[PDB]
């Protein structure tokens, strides 16, 4: 019965023999808690979208080889079902590289266990891991195909491959053959690339339909002409029409005018083009999922994106303006729209210092350290995300300050340095490769190294992390390393072992509790946590990793806190890992505190 | 162990041997859905109140003699246990008469089966009814007394008896004796009356502590001197310090300024007096629970009262201002206050005509009518609330207008008249005692009569309802009546068995709310643009009466717990006067859900 195909004769899609054009919005299920999937999807449907687009991040689902996550917030099958049940069609973008301001572009870090791997190429090791991943992911997607009764109408192969240097056409042909093998010969397979022959040159492949992406800054005619070069026949498609843009820590929050998006959307729609709004809701990079760009600049925790639906799912002016545009072309669903969620200001919650990272080494690294003559990377010590502590002793007296240095700029990405429990300051990828330290010969030198996000775009996505090259002290290479991978996630969930197992300050864990009453229909509510007086770190509430805060740089001050991780009667435990400076010294305990507010601050003065 | 008592030395209470002063607010559990009891009580606690005060409406718990409701929303025991759990003490006002802008001041309508009953007196049948009720209620209250480890610290006997004409002291003494028999000798019993010798005369009794009530317009020194004249020693107590005032359909919405409440509150607290804010939350008169005053004027569905918490439980400017006054005397609890609930505008919902009242008599009256030579009252035909259809046939032809009148003003309280299914207009208690009708001889004359709420204050509380005296057509007494009591509640629940003016009719429609949305359903307000007068149910729950034609209330409060996501929600409207549904345009036959209340329209 069920068919979805390209009508080449008629520059169109056919959906069960009928002319079809899609109006889609990007939503990433990995950036929205499952609790709220239905809420966002319904808001998307009510805007008049007939389809949604999503990425499948490979590393989100296979964080260790052969160890899969497809349940709860990782249940892509369920997400796709929910979309179908709401009558939305799905454009699937399964990678295996997705870019997406997401850690390493979705690629698993354990691929880097072969140091010389050439990612996104016919490197046989890269291919064997890709093939094994597709043999798991694609048969799950097969019954979700439009023709087998599900919502999936088109599937993207790779992501803007033409923007990458390797230009390996055997890789692309390999992906095509495997996608076909698992999904069959009917499913529409496409590529997406920047709208210019120079990008199309290496990204397009015969047998995969060529689509382009472009934003409100682009000349629409020119963009679609570049697509028409590779596809003289078939529908016009903008796979990523930018509703906003990404951010970086320390840069002003990106915004795009409502009128600019509305007018461009109108013109695209007026050409009979199919179009996807990237992003429709952006959401959040929880835990360590954010990516980065080269030269090294990490994206922050919020992926608000200035999208039509805000980070927390709110209806914005942009949302209504885009809905109004769509209404000019198609009948939008009737009835009231699910609302922006209520937000609640829980107020100030005092914390207190529990333990330094040094003191918690036993619980953080319960299998003990790896010893090495020279430093090893995160990947070599089997750590992908978070922090690794590197330890050695001073091989000479440093009563006078001696330069600690990474001559090849190999601190990836930030190191918090202490000598005998005295913090010495910070080393920084690019910015500061030398730090003066003092202390006695034989003193314990500690470097707490944070992976701030693997680069997700450009040539340097093989971003190893850790001390990736030697450190010197007064110019001599430092040797004899004791290296502790830190299981911060487990440790925080056991309250650093406390619950069993059923200027600068030292990096440390600060904890505090707050209660919310039960039997109140409208509590808990969503909230935003803010860190007045803190500097940089990670935050958990009830062991859920909300992401990184960095009020010292901005633009993001608050972090989003979804209500479903909050409990009533039972105390809610906040854990803060502060890396640089905590406001918790003086008499005043009231300074050692966070505050929950009812409005986000993601773009301050 | 636990003790609560009046100390006449320090002119205060002693709670466990220590000086105690209560700062209380009124909340009536019968006017707030149980779903929201903890929310309202916690907001009260967060205001700095150390106590709540409530009435027990007898008729809410004993709708027929020997038939009791103490479950779910009628669960007074649970409500008091809940106040206790949250650290609130309770001042209990069990009546038997409570006044309270509540149907018949809480007295059950079945008392009026004795037509000559003198309510609120030593009338032996009245006493015997009361005594049986106290024998069911007060043993439930005994374990909830402070001395037995519950929250109840004082108990009011009767309610402003000094404002009633009877002045029957044997009645008050009987109550005191029965309360003592069921509750024991330690419980602090008290009375409440207007703060003037003329009100205290018949209201005060020896052995019952005398308290006064008064609002923001009163001289506080004088108000307390009149109490002191009755109780030279003991706590000063304002049992009802008005934060607002009641409403009447067709009168402007009552408001009292925050600055006036805060100012008087501070003044009363500063004197060391115990005080109860009436109302702290007013809530809603759902179904037919509203009262009325004489000369006949019904209170509306909303009991918002201009209280510190709004009808729907919202934190108002008045709320924060009184909290700040309480803070000057007492540390209030720490932490954030529960929020005003989110409100959602579900929008416009179209309804269709189901059946006129005329066509649904099988379903409304499955027992068949009662035949009578002259008209019978609601009570005589065994109905208390709602609507009764009175039917006769025209004796002479009426081609020319003929006066249809109740020469003794005996339509209690409003009648919707049709002749052979042609609406004629409306007869109204105290207002329109004559209406002209036409029709042919032998025509069917129908009067749908509404009990608009039994008077709850003054001498005329024995308010029977129905056609209480004869009707005349062209001066001739109309006789031979066929009288149908109407089971509106059942019929509405059954979707009427099918699981200028217009004829009284039921209109129904439906709306869906999506499931798996964390923040729906939400509270809302229903509005009836184009409609005139009627009753509304949602999912068979009777939300009350609407009357946008008179105001000041236009919207009715709809609590979210009655709304579902698994199946469509049904709205049923019974429109009594004129429905916007004739129209070629079915879109006009519709109600609207909005996210803000309109209870003070001009
Ligand atoms: C600092 C320079 C910015 C790098 C630009 C990123 C590459 C653009 N390609 C497309 C656009 C975005 C932007 O949100 C996403 O990364 C998409 O995944 C990518 O396909
Ligand atoms: C026509 C207006 C006459 C109103 C008379 C009010 C009766 C005074 N009684 C006290 C005050 C009020 C007002 O909310 C309540 O009815 C109380 O139950 C009552 O004790
Ligand atoms: C965009 O480019 C096309 C050329 O293909 C041109 O016709 C059109 O005028 C351009 N729009 C401008 C200049 O804004
Ligand atoms: C470290 O100290 C030396 C003094 O020996 C000074 O020249 C240099 O600027 C300092 N380096 C840094 C990175 O502060
Ligand atoms: C460390 O220094 C030694 C000696 O130069 C060199 O062989 C080794 O490759 C360096 N290791 C790293 C990780 O930079
Ligand atoms: C915070 O709550 C957790 C869970 O009860 C507990 O283990 C920890 O000791 C608490 N501390 C305080 C101050 O409440
Ligand atoms: C109230 O009455 C007293 C006399 O009893 C008088 O002195 C006082 O000023 C009055 N107070 C106010 C506020 O009117
Ligand atoms: C009824 O109609 C008669 C004759 O038209 C008129 O005299 C009388 O005033 C009317 N009464 C009312 C109450 O309308
Ligand atoms: C109605 O009229 C008859 C005859 O006068 C009289 O007996 C009876 O008391 C009246 N009934 C009522 C209900 O007024
Ligand atoms: C149910 O909902 C639709 C939408 O308003 C309406 O057309 C229909 O009449 C309703 N069904 C009923 C009232 O049985
Ligand atoms: Cl996407
Ligand atoms: Cl009360």
mmCIF file of N, CA, C and O in Angstrom, chain A residues 258-288:
data_model
loop_
_atom_site.group_PDB
_atom_site.id
_atom_site.type_symbol
_atom_site.label_atom_id
_atom_site.label_comp_id
_atom_site.label_asym_id
_atom_site.label_seq_id
_atom_site.Cartn_x
_atom_site.Cartn_y
_atom_site.Cartn_z
ATOM 1 N N UNK A 258 13.147 37.614 14.020
ATOM 2 C CA UNK A 258 11.903 36.919 13.650
ATOM 3 C C UNK A 258 11.464 37.213 12.198
ATOM 4 O O UNK A 258 11.144 36.292 11.432
ATOM 5 N N UNK A 259 11.452 38.500 11.835
ATOM 6 C CA UNK A 259 11.104 38.927 10.475
ATOM 7 C C UNK A 259 12.036 38.313 9.397
ATOM 8 O O UNK A 259 11.564 37.945 8.331
ATOM 9 N N UNK A 260 13.330 38.167 9.699
ATOM 10 C CA UNK A 260 14.276 37.614 8.725
ATOM 11 C C UNK A 260 13.963 36.138 8.478
ATOM 12 O O UNK A 260 13.916 35.665 7.328
ATOM 13 N N UNK A 261 13.673 35.409 9.555
ATOM 14 C CA UNK A 261 13.296 33.996 9.390
ATOM 15 C C UNK A 261 11.931 33.856 8.674
ATOM 16 O O UNK A 261 11.759 32.992 7.793
ATOM 17 N N UNK A 262 10.977 34.701 9.051
ATOM 18 C CA UNK A 262 9.618 34.589 8.487
ATOM 19 C C UNK A 262 9.621 34.856 6.980
ATOM 20 O O UNK A 262 9.080 34.048 6.189
ATOM 21 N N UNK A 263 10.279 35.942 6.580
ATOM 22 C CA UNK A 263 10.350 36.301 5.158
ATOM 23 C C UNK A 263 11.075 35.277 4.299
ATOM 24 O O UNK A 263 10.682 35.024 3.166
ATOM 25 N N UNK A 264 12.160 34.725 4.834
ATOM 26 C CA UNK A 264 12.907 33.697 4.105
ATOM 27 C C UNK A 264 12.098 32.430 4.007
ATOM 28 O O UNK A 264 12.068 31.797 2.951
ATOM 29 N N UNK A 265 11.427 32.064 5.103
ATOM 30 C CA UNK A 265 10.586 30.873 5.095
ATOM 31 C C UNK A 265 9.526 31.018 4.015
ATOM 32 O O UNK A 265 9.310 30.068 3.243
ATOM 33 N N UNK A 266 8.883 32.193 3.974
ATOM 34 C CA UNK A 266 7.835 32.470 2.977
ATOM 35 C C UNK A 266 8.382 32.232 1.589
ATOM 36 O O UNK A 266 7.759 31.531 0.802
ATOM 37 N N UNK A 267 9.562 32.779 1.296
ATOM 38 C CA UNK A 267 10.117 32.696 -0.083
ATOM 39 C C UNK A 267 10.498 31.289 -0.466
ATOM 40 O O UNK A 267 10.298 30.878 -1.608
ATOM 41 N N UNK A 268 11.089 30.560 0.485
ATOM 42 C CA UNK A 268 11.383 29.157 0.273
ATOM 43 C C UNK A 268 10.100 28.400 -0.040
ATOM 44 O O UNK A 268 10.035 27.649 -1.044
ATOM 45 N N UNK A 269 9.081 28.601 0.799
ATOM 46 C CA UNK A 269 7.811 27.875 0.632
ATOM 47 C C UNK A 269 7.167 28.222 -0.716
ATOM 48 O O UNK A 269 6.624 27.346 -1.408
ATOM 49 N N UNK A 270 7.266 29.502 -1.087
ATOM 50 C CA UNK A 270 6.707 29.983 -2.356
ATOM 51 C C UNK A 270 7.355 29.320 -3.590
ATOM 52 O O UNK A 270 6.732 29.262 -4.637
ATOM 53 N N UNK A 271 8.576 28.796 -3.479
ATOM 54 C CA UNK A 271 9.161 28.036 -4.603
ATOM 55 C C UNK A 271 8.673 26.600 -4.719
ATOM 56 O O UNK A 271 9.072 25.886 -5.634
ATOM 57 N N UNK A 272 7.809 26.171 -3.801
ATOM 58 C CA UNK A 272 7.348 24.794 -3.800
ATOM 59 C C UNK A 272 8.389 23.868 -3.181
ATOM 60 O O UNK A 272 8.246 22.642 -3.229
ATOM 61 N N UNK A 273 9.424 24.458 -2.582
ATOM 62 C CA UNK A 273 10.510 23.700 -1.959
ATOM 63 C C UNK A 273 10.027 23.000 -0.698
ATOM 64 O O UNK A 273 9.144 23.517 0.012
ATOM 65 N N UNK A 274 10.586 21.823 -0.440
ATOM 66 C CA UNK A 274 10.496 21.227 0.866
ATOM 67 C C UNK A 274 11.547 21.929 1.711
ATOM 68 O O UNK A 274 12.557 22.379 1.170
ATOM 69 N N UNK A 275 11.318 22.024 3.023
ATOM 70 C CA UNK A 275 12.227 22.760 3.904
ATOM 71 C C UNK A 275 12.182 22.266 5.352
ATOM 72 O O UNK A 275 11.112 21.926 5.885
ATOM 73 N N UNK A 276 13.357 22.190 5.968
ATOM 74 C CA UNK A 276 13.461 21.879 7.385
ATOM 75 C C UNK A 276 14.041 23.039 8.185
ATOM 76 O O UNK A 276 15.112 23.531 7.854
ATOM 77 N N UNK A 277 13.359 23.426 9.259
ATOM 78 C CA UNK A 277 13.840 24.488 10.161
ATOM 79 C C UNK A 277 14.831 23.926 11.204
ATOM 80 O O UNK A 277 14.453 23.162 12.103
ATOM 81 N N UNK A 278 16.100 24.302 11.048
ATOM 82 C CA UNK A 278 17.159 23.938 11.986
ATOM 83 C C UNK A 278 17.499 25.157 12.876
ATOM 84 O O UNK A 278 17.971 26.154 12.348
ATOM 85 N N UNK A 279 17.280 25.150 14.193
ATOM 86 C CA UNK A 279 16.554 24.159 14.966
ATOM 87 C C UNK A 279 15.122 24.662 15.144
ATOM 88 O O UNK A 279 14.883 25.895 15.131
ATOM 89 N N UNK A 280 14.175 23.737 15.317
ATOM 90 C CA UNK A 280 12.862 24.157 15.737
ATOM 91 C C UNK A 280 12.759 24.315 17.277
ATOM 92 O O UNK A 280 12.248 25.336 17.806
ATOM 93 N N UNK A 281 13.217 23.291 17.996
ATOM 94 C CA UNK A 281 13.587 23.484 19.389
ATOM 95 C C UNK A 281 15.012 23.002 19.470
ATOM 96 O O UNK A 281 15.318 21.973 18.895
ATOM 97 N N UNK A 282 15.882 23.784 20.120
ATOM 98 C CA UNK A 282 17.292 23.393 20.293
ATOM 99 C C UNK A 282 17.480 22.521 21.534
ATOM 100 O O UNK A 282 18.028 21.426 21.459
ATOM 101 N N UNK A 283 17.021 23.011 22.688
ATOM 102 C CA UNK A 283 17.162 22.250 23.927
ATOM 103 C C UNK A 283 18.494 22.451 24.617
ATOM 104 O O UNK A 283 19.010 23.569 24.661
ATOM 105 N N UNK A 284 19.069 21.360 25.124
ATOM 106 C CA UNK A 284 20.194 21.425 26.067
ATOM 107 C C UNK A 284 21.221 20.355 25.757
ATOM 108 O O UNK A 284 20.853 19.254 25.340
ATOM 109 N N UNK A 285 22.496 20.697 25.926
ATOM 110 C CA UNK A 285 23.612 19.722 25.944
ATOM 111 C C UNK A 285 23.889 19.371 27.389
ATOM 112 O O UNK A 285 24.688 20.046 28.061
ATOM 113 N N UNK A 286 23.188 18.357 27.879
ATOM 114 C CA UNK A 286 23.375 17.878 29.231
ATOM 115 C C UNK A 286 24.728 17.168 29.350
ATOM 116 O O UNK A 286 25.361 16.840 28.337
ATOM 117 N N UNK A 287 25.171 16.967 30.593
ATOM 118 C CA UNK A 287 26.408 16.212 30.878
ATOM 119 C C UNK A 287 27.585 16.809 30.104
ATOM 120 O O UNK A 287 27.837 17.992 30.240
ATOM 121 N N UNK A 288 28.282 16.024 29.295
ATOM 122 C CA UNK A 288 29.454 16.513 28.545
ATOM 123 C C UNK A 288 29.180 16.428 27.057
ATOM 124 O O UNK A 288 30.093 16.227 26.261
#
